[PDB]
Amino acid sequence: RFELSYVELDKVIDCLRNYKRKVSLDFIDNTLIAEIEGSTKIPISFKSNLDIDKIIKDLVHNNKLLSFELLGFKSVEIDATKISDKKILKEILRD
RNA sequence: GUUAAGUCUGGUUUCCCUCCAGGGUAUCUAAGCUUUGAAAAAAA
Numbered sequence A: 001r002f003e004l005s006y007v008e009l010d011k012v013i014d015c016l017r018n019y020k021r022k023v024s025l026d027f028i029d030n031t032l033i034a035e036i037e038g039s040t041k042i043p044i045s046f047k048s049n050l051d052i053d054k055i056i057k058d059l060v061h062n063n064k065l066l067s068f069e070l071l072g073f074k075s076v077e078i079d080a081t082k083i084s085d086k087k088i089l090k091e092i093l094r095d
Numbered sequence B: 001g002u003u004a005a006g007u008c009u010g011g012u013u014u015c016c017c018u019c020c021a022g023g024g025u026a027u028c029u030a031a032g033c034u035u036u037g038a039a040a041a042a043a044a
Helices: A056-062 A086-094
Strands: A004-008 A020-026 A033-036 A040-043 A045-048 A075-079
Touching (some): A004 A086, A075 A086
Antiparallel strands (some): A004 A045
């Protein structure tokens, strides 16, 4: 099963508060980055249970169909303008 | 070639009781009282 042993946010949450931004992801470069349409791209450190074989990243980045159906599993439009604690933003970005 | 964007769909149908048993057994009256007391032979 998929186990996310840890993900080192608390830096993405910083640059998110009081704003309404779309948090895009990208997994090429072998390190998970978290693009923000509010013009910042924080590289995310994480440890998972699945080892993406470095062939799968390329198979998804090259196949224009895969990278197209990947738009739906890639982003959230987080709205922190109103009351927005850090913990629930953590769970949002974690999921 | 470059970018940028995902969009649609988020439980339906059927079945809602069927069969057997629908009373059986015991008791079905019992014990008393079964006539009594007045008038039986009357005046013309």
